[PDB]
Design a protein around this nucleic acid. Structure first.
Length: 333
RNA sequence: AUACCGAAGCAGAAUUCGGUAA
RNA sequence: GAAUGUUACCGCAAUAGUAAUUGAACUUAGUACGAGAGGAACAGUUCAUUCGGAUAAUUGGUUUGCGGCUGUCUGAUCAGGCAGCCGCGAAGCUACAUCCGCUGGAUUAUGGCUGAACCCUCUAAGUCAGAUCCAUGCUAGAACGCGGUGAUUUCUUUGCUCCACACAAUAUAGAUGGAUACGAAUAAGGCGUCCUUGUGGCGUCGCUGAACCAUAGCAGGCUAGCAACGGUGCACUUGGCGGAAAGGCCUUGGGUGCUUGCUGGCGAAUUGCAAUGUCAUUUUGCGUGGGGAUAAAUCAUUUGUAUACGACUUAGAUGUACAACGGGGUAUUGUAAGCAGUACUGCUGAGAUUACCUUUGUUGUCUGAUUUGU
């Protein structure tokens, strides 16, 4: 057994705690250092191997790729940090004036029984000329060194019975922390898309809690060197609008995703599998730095995508395939 | 446990020796 | 899972566990070498084996649900009620399935530079290249670590909280004028000045704080006069600085006492020759007035990512919120009940189930007990 991955004690929460960020680039424009989303099932994808010298070089090759259910990231605040001899410390936290019901639920377990006195008087302080809630920005500018944005996911968009919001801190790539806080404030209550941070062929890393076998499993894990193959937009239609297979369909498997994960929002395709099963929230990061190897730098296309259901063994790809061979079906037509 | 140095009439391949190190 | 404020969310990390590993192919190659066969090599690329984490794209040992097969039989073909067998296949157990498994410093052995010991010297003063130690990363989080943040019982007869005054208990790891702020060197640094502004010139300081600020009044009162509007106890007000443990530093203007800077008038006694002769706050308790806000958690209900049992993850006090359904998709089966007679033929790839998604219309529910609170 691995010595580093011991003891095997289970994680304390579904969300995996991120404790490392890709340094701090003082020259890059302001951008998010990571992304948050939810994990769906898995599928299959094939692409052309442009890698030189490979056995399957310049040939179509099948690769296993998972699908991450990514809801839009709506900013709710930002957190500043200051260097100290006792380690990094969060000097001040601020919020985006207004908070959705899902965000308020995160602070409540018996939400229905509670009088729902969530963020309210704080908004009353904001409901004026600003003063303290505006001087906090100046205080952050004066002393802060690294600023982490505070965002939550649109859980109600995800097909999850649990409507409680999930929130985590994300560091800002850009320098000039004044610009960091200015951009964060301007983005208060705004919605951020995947294209604003990640991009196709980027070697992102995945971190999440492992599957529980029902103590084996249910522990946080980090997987690095995973290449994105296509930015997905499940809000629209015809997600399979690739250059090949001009018979546009949807990435959703027949009858919906197995067990759970009926995609109804943005999604992303990532090379290989991801730790943990569906219904688990997964955070994405740029993998610190980008390797210069062809396996990490080369860009890839996409073609065949499997759509047959897995509620059994799998056969039918689309409902329109059932005709001709079955003759008459008086029960239906 | 593998390799890093100096030497051999060590052309190359290849081989041996003194030190580091398990 | 027990305790410091109540509860909960997002964070930091003192600390500890460390992780990768070997071979193979191209191009540098038939190149340098070399009579000759034979055959280097850095760097750039492509794969798998040893080991580790994952998930099921596929595979794999792994809902009597669909077709029919035997027996006890309803009378009788339609039914298997009871005990199972041949094809398809999940649900999980669970691997013979798949991907991935990182880049920066200081060193040493070692190769040099400057340069004495005494021409030389990689070493004595230092330094460049350079594998063992630490960093990056991953895993847990002091449950005897820390920061920020959502809210602070509308009646315990202001209940909670911060303040003003106001009486007690509680004790001190131990006041009895003042922690009375640069940096850098110790084979030199300040101070005041000059400036043709520098590693500069001039005068000079240390050799201890054995000092600096203050220190006089019944333990510190009343009052009179002189010189200035300086010093200072205290309530305000304009503004700046301090985020490392900033929680302090002040700054403008008056207001109000003292002023021992100087000169006078008042009382000190009896504690009897002394008995620390009681003056600081740390915490907590009770009595009023000046304001501020009025919430949260457990069980229940349940969920299924979780699941040996705990635990964990959820939904709900009026909106497609919770949940039933048949429908729809999904998976499965290949000729079912009968009727058309030509000794199996059209309905009939049929009906069909469907613990996965789906909940479109109807329909039912939406209200309880306990606890917390500086």
């Amino acid at each position: 057994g691995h010595l580093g991955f011991l003891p095997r004690k289970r994680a304390a929460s579904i969300r995996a705690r991120v404790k490392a960020f890709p340094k701090d680039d003082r020259s890059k424009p302001v951008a998010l250092t990571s992304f948050l989303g939810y994990k769906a099932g898995m599928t299959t994808i094939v692409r052309d191997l442009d890698r030189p010298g490979s056995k399957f070089h310049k040939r179509e090759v099948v690769e296993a790729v998972t699908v991450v259910d990514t809801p839009p990231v709506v900013v709710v605040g930002v957190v500043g940090y200051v260097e100290t001899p006792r380690g990094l410390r969060s000097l001040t936290t601020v919020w985006a004036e207004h908070l959705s019901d899902e965000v308020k639920r995160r602070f409540y377990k018996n939400w229905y029984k509670s009088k729902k006195k969530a963020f309210t008087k704080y908004s009353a302080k904001y409901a004026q000329d600003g003063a303290g809630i505006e001087r906090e920005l100046a205080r952050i500018k004066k002393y802060a060194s690294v600023v982490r944005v505070l965002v939550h996911t649109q859980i109600r968009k995800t097909p999850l019975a649990q409507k409680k919001a999930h929130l985590a801190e994300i560091q800002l790539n850009g320098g000039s922390i004044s610009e960091k806080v200015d951009w964060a404030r301007e983005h208060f209550e705004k919605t951020v898309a995947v294209d604003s941070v990640f991009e196709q062929n980027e070697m992102i890393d995945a971190i999440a809690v492992t599957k529980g076998h029902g103590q084996r499993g249910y522990h946080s894990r980090t997987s690095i060197n995973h290449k994105i193959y296509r930015v997905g937009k499940g809000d629209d239609e015809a997600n399979g609008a690739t250059s090949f297979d001009r018979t546009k369909k949807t990435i959703t498997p027949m009858g919906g995703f197995v067990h759970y994960g009926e995609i109804k929002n943005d999604f992303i395709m990532v090379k290989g599998c991801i730790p943990g099963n569906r219904k688990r929230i997964v955070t994405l990061r740029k993998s610190l730095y980008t390797n210069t190897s062809r396996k990490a730098l080369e860009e890839v296309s996409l073609k065949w995508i499997d759509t047959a259901s897995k509620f059994g063994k799998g056969r039918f790809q689309t409902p329109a395939e059932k005709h001709a061979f079955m003759g008459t079906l008086k029960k239906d037509l």
